[PDB]
Amino acid sequence: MSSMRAERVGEQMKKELMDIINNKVKDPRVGFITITDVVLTNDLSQAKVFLTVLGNDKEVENTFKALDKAKGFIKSELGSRMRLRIMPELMYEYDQSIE
């Protein structure tokens, strides 16, 4: 479940998503939102977006809801930055790997 195409598109989405989310979606009263990786399926139909977010357990959960609420806005801004015709479905995941 990782062709070279999928890895390359994921690096572009990582960069584009971090910009979109931090400069246009995020409440200024919360810290930066770090995207550590974007992992796509080979047909690019799904993207798992791994995240580092700052705060307590409820600030983490408040942040996930804001991003889910903004999914239409985020796919649209992403689609306007990439020749890709149909956007993947975006799934926001906490990055367990990091303590």
Numbering used by the authors: 1 to 99
Sentences from the paper on this structure:
One such assembly factor involved in small ribosomal subunit maturation is the ribosomal binding factor A (RbfA). RbfA proteins have a KH-domain-(type II)-like fold which is characteristic of RNA- and ssDNA-binding proteins. The RbfA facilitates the correct folding of the functional core of rRNA and is required for 30S maturation and translation initiation.
The crystal structure of S. aureus RbfA consists of three α-helices and three β-strands in an α1-β1-β2-α2-α3-β3 order characteristic of RbfA homologs and other proteins with KH-domain (type II) organization. Three α-helices are located opposite three antiparallel β-strands, with the following amino acid composition: α1 (4–25), β1 (34–40), β2 (46–52), α2 (57–69), α3 (71–81), and β3 (89–94). The α2 and α3 helices are located at an angle (~120°) with strongly conserved Ala70 at the kink. This is the helix–kink–helix motif (hkh) of the KH-domain (the GXXG motif is presented by AXG in RbfA). Analysis of the electrostatic surface potential map (at pH = 7.5, as this pH is favorable for ribosomes) revealed a negatively charged region covering the area between α2 and β3 towards β1 via the top of β3 followed by the C-terminus. These features of RbfA organization ensure formation of an extensive interface for interacting with the 16S rRNA core of the 30S subunit.
